[PDB]
Symmetry: D2
Subunit: 268 residues, 4 copies
């Protein structure tokens, strides 16, 4: 009986209990939505992590680089929610860039094969998922993806940043197609969140310099954000995604909503 | 028991039953909010128009250019909602520019006294209202103002456009102050809506050329908007404002949410 | 025989030998341009300061808030460059905001009369000058104004920032009119330069907090700028203005060129 | 004795006498620069086309997707300009996207292998070229690439647009590295130019719908541009690139200069 009461939503991107996607799924269910999850390759793990969600939800395997996974995607989803039913929302919360495209490894030293894999998973997959799922979405539906403001360069993030720039551009095009189905397509630019991977990197997983740079980046965030920013709490981001999945933002598409504490609206 | 259940919200800007503000108030009340309205100078009229709202709400006079109105504002609002209570939201939906700053009258022919009056009411008042109301707002509160994308020049709108550019900049600063009170400050950029004034202008109220230019502007909107745009329906805009007044966009401030059908994300 | 060889250019904004305008005039003359200067109210001083320029140039009084000054402006300029001749360029390098609109004085405490005076001189005057001068400009001409990136809020600058937001918007409209005369209109966003006033402020002229905030702002600039930034050297900015006055940027108008060392293209 | 007198500049991208690059090379030489050209795979043709340039210039083969070409690039360039000498400028004017990523072929039907090839040549190569050439560039040097505003979606261009979004982001990062060598990195966003390929497409080479869409896009350009736009004349674009290669835009890097007639600063 909440924001998403009666909505059927597919949520990808869960890998650990610290994933933004995990918190997206929790808030969504708390708000009355029925979910259908998708996981990359460690499904046994994802399954075990997802049992902790408020309610149960079927888990479907989905390797965004696998054409067969995508081709059969809509089929398996309908099977999970039952024939005759369609999705009202889709959450894209996946991203990746080989170590070579981030951290201390110099920007120029990233081989195209690695950058291409990063863009395939981080940006193109947004279009892939929409393509596979639009056929089984209801008018008024909503697709949303996770993003971070790449309008300016920054240290460490390197090619992952370039992948976001590409993603934002793909979103604007996905909106054109999604509009034919009465569906909206938007992105959510979050502030930095301490997921497992992020912590590992801050801890020096990808080099000391990278870790040091990303650390004072997080610190400058809470300082710039007029309402502050708590990197250990992904709830404010999960709510924003749910706001976009609801019926309360019916006139916005091909857009980006910033859930970063307002940090990007301030020089300092 | 809706989006704004239990929220006390002040809504300015109602002048006719076609005002964006009127539709903001309606949706807000339908969602369980208690309102406190403010009107410019024709209160008898505003009063008569507002009786048509779902529920009743006290109407307070407020001339945004009157220092006394603003000085006593918070006092009269507390009186209306009762001592001990505070506002959880504030909607700024006022705007104005003398005929000389819009339409066929050439851009260069607008005397500064007129432009200054337009900016005083359309942009500075956003800061004025926040100043007067922040002292009586609850943490988690939300201030929202009506806006239109002025990132690019356009015919007819002339100085009103310049006033919006100023407004967007004031919003970013209001967010800095509002943040000290745990309050967010955002703007909503709407697509063109056929209010009384807009219709009059399209009908040639400010010259034939102006009317003709604004008319094909509205037409290009629905064409560019991936989800289309209905200029006669302000409901999609009212909902977006309510989304910002709710607790579902807790990490965004000093920002702009586009409720324009996605028209600004497309070249054509 | 340089960049502006044979060009007649009017340059406003000189007040001391540290003014951006002073350096604009110097580089322009070094590049073969004939100038016509305008000064605010201390002409004896301006005159004495300008004698130091490479070559001599007539000085005309111009109070941007004085309608008579503007009305007779074109007349006096033609007299100075001789009947039959027209200007090929115009440099707007003036700006002002009462103490109340900047520094430690809280944002909300700036009375509209002060903000309005600041916007009149800092933004509207851009339109005023174009209006008066376009009638006496040659096709291929170029108008340029001084600006600073106000796309994000920042401490201390307060309303002066809002005035720039307005200026950028006015520039886009001035371009529409200037285009009818075959003339371009652009702005140059400079990094912080240590003019007399800026130094005074950094020294605490408008409060200690303001001075401290602006000081670490300048420091963060050179750090973010991929090519660095030297606040004591206005030459890089003067050259950029001359680039816009030349014939080498013939397809850009209603635009903004950033001469800030590239600081705005980087988060850090 | 012109803008680039004494400058050694490498210019890639020439394929026909209608290529933007061809006009870049012409204006550059007319302004006193010594060039070193690079061509893709039809060197016999490029050679024959380039004989028509004002002066002669060595042509080096360069397949941006060939690691060997890039690895030996700097070596062959030094050989061409003679040991002891370095480049003062580099022009990246290459772009490509398989038919499947543009035109009538639906956005969702573009296989990643094709999109990846387009991004490799259109965006990543900007970084590749900088990497290979920075070691042999002089302080004060300048790298510039051709671009088109992809901030908004548009019909027909599809993935090529996404590739530009990526390119703009890569440019901001290239600037960080180039800055270490005292070198600037900028992009030039041009209005539509009737190159051979563009004409072919307008003529229906990639489908009738695509051709029709791109045709009214070009038409809307001249209408929006305050100074107009001539799609058959690439000279205004060539000059802008030369402006960036000169010493008159010393404080701008990681940026984008719009040589589009000012079309992007206007809604209509
Ligand atoms: C200064 C620069 C900056 C950076 C940020 C951020 O990085 C911030 C913004 C977006 N995001 C995005 O949020 C999404 C989820 O990431 P999380 O942080 O939750 O991390 P997780 O690693 O927990 O989860 C995401 C998913 O990646 C998935 N994976 C990889 N390849 C595939 C594939 N091929 N198919 C299917 N799944 C795959 C994986 O299985 C996993 O479930 C991504 O799109 C992110 O980029 C995360 C942020 C953070 N801080 O952790 C914010 C502000 N400024
Ligand atoms: C191509 C350019 C463009 C324009 C738009 C728009 O103009 C669109 C966007 C914002 N708005 C904003 O919405 C707000 C409300 O305007 P409405 O359209 O409802 O019109 P209304 O005239 O109905 O209502 C607004 C209020 O102005 C108030 N008024 C004037 N002076 C004062 C004062 N001094 N003190 C108190 N009240 C005063 C007046 O009393 C009235 O209630 C304003 O801030 C508008 O600019 C309206 C739009 C429209 N189409 O009608 C959208 C996209 N592109
Ligand atoms: C973090 C915020 C920020 C700020 C900046 C800047 O402030 C920077 C950018 C633009 N500018 C602009 O450059 C122009 C010239 O300012 P200067 O710095 O040279 O200062 P000056 O005070 O030397 O000169 C400008 C003129 O103001 C003129 N004046 C006032 N009123 C009038 C009037 N009514 N009629 C005629 N003249 C009048 C006055 O006579 C004087 O000649 C203005 O438009 C400025 O805002 C200056 C900067 C600086 N650092 O000094 C850059 C980056 N980030
Ligand atoms: C509404 C959308 C839109 C589009 C535009 C434009 O497309 C406009 C903007 C940039 N450009 C860019 O200008 C550059 C040059 O393109 P031209 O138009 O001259 O076309 P050309 O085809 O003449 O030349 C470019 C080069 O591509 C080169 N090529 C392909 N692969 C490789 C490779 N692997 N290695 C080396 N060379 C290769 C090829 O050899 C050729 O010399 C590119 O980066 C373009 O995208 C061209 C425009 C136009 N109208 O022709 C402008 C505004 N709005």
């Amino acid at each position: 009986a909440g924001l998403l009461d009666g909505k059927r939503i597919l949520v990808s991107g869960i890998i650990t209990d610290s994933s933004i996607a995990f918190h997206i799924a929790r808030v969504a269910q708390e708000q009355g939505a029925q979910l259908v999850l998708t996981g990359f390759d460690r499904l046994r793990l994802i399954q075990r992590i997802t049992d902790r969600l408020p309610a149960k939800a079927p888990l479907l395997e989905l390797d965004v680089q696998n054409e067969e996974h995508l081709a059969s995607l809509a089929g398996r989803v309908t099977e999970a929610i039952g024939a005759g039913n369609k999705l009202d929302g889709v959450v894209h919360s996946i991203g990746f860039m080989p170590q070579t495209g981030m951290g201390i490894n110099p920007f120029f030293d990233a081989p195209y094969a690695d950058v291409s894999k990063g863009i395939h998973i981080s940006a193109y997959s947004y279009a892939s998922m929409a393509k596979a799922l639009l056929p089984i979405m209801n008018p008024g539906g909503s697709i949303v993806g996770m993003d971070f403001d790449p309008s300016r360069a920054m240290p460490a993030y390197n090619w992952m940043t370039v992948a976001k720039s590409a993603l934002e551009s793909v979103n604007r095009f996905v909106a054109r197609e999604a509009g034919k189905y009465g569906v909206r397509s938007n992105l959510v630019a979050a502030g930095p969140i301490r997921t497992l991977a992020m912590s590992a990197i801050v801890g020096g997983a990808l080099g000391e310099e990278a870790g040091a740079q990303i650390q004072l980046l997080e610190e400058g965030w809470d300082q710039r954000a007029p309402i502050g920013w708590n990197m250990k709490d992904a709830t404010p981001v999960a709510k924003t995604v749910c706001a976009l999945l609801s019926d309360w933002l019916p006139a916005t598409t091909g857009d980006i909503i910033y859930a970063d504490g307002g940090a990007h609206t301030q020089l300092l």
